[PDB]
Nucleic acid binder design. Structure first.
Length: 133
RNA sequence: GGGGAUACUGCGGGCCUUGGGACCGGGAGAGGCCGGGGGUACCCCUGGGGUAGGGGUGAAAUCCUAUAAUCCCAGGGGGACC
């Protein structure tokens, strides 16, 4: 119980956003201790509705209120679209979730598109012609 | 079968330098080969965290996951690719 004068506790919200779901995941400043992890698939029951900025805001609110219960007055943001051979655009859930966090009242610090981009590229799926849908 | 002409072609000889070849100089270039050193990304293993879903679709399911998954963190390894 260190004598905390500031009560400016800062954590990190890692936001995995894709075209199929979104995961809010709040940790300490390191990232090695988790404090809240909420998903579209927790907050709803329709798979097609998992990605939505609706239910993204809800997952964000639940994770936020849990974290600001536990302390953590502010959060840095690390939004992450899927990997290198997959898509490199996050989705709507990202901006929706950061807006939801600000609404919840956590001081949003610095934001970063921490998306793993390859300097080479493994082969992506779909084959030579892609998805012929 | 003879005789004649000699521009062109051929044959022989000689000269030339414009075509081409050689050389020299400073540059250019993802030309090639061989060696070394790296870059993310991805996958697996280990350890820590943290629990109930993840994934995928037009919508779903197969599949993965409560032996602890997805997510996050620290290490190790791997093969491709720049």
């Amino acid at each position: 119980q260190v004598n905390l004068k500031k009560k400016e506790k800062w954590g990190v919200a890692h936001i995995y956003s894709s075209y199929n779901n979104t995961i809010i995941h709040i940790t300490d400043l390191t990232g090695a201790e988790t404090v809240s992890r909420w998903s579209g698939g927790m907050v709803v029951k329709a798979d097609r509705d998992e990605p939505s900025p609706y239910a993204a805001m809800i997952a964000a609110r639940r994770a936020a209120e849990e974290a600001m219960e536990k302390g953590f007055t502010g959060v840095h943001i690390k939004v992450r679209a899927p990997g290198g051979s997959k898509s490199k655009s996050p989705g709507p859930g990202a901006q929706a979730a950061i807006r939801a966090l600000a609404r919840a009242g956590l001081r949003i610090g610095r934001v970063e598109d921490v998306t793993p981009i390859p300097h080479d590229g493994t082969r992506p799926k779909g084959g030579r012609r892609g998805r012929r849908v």
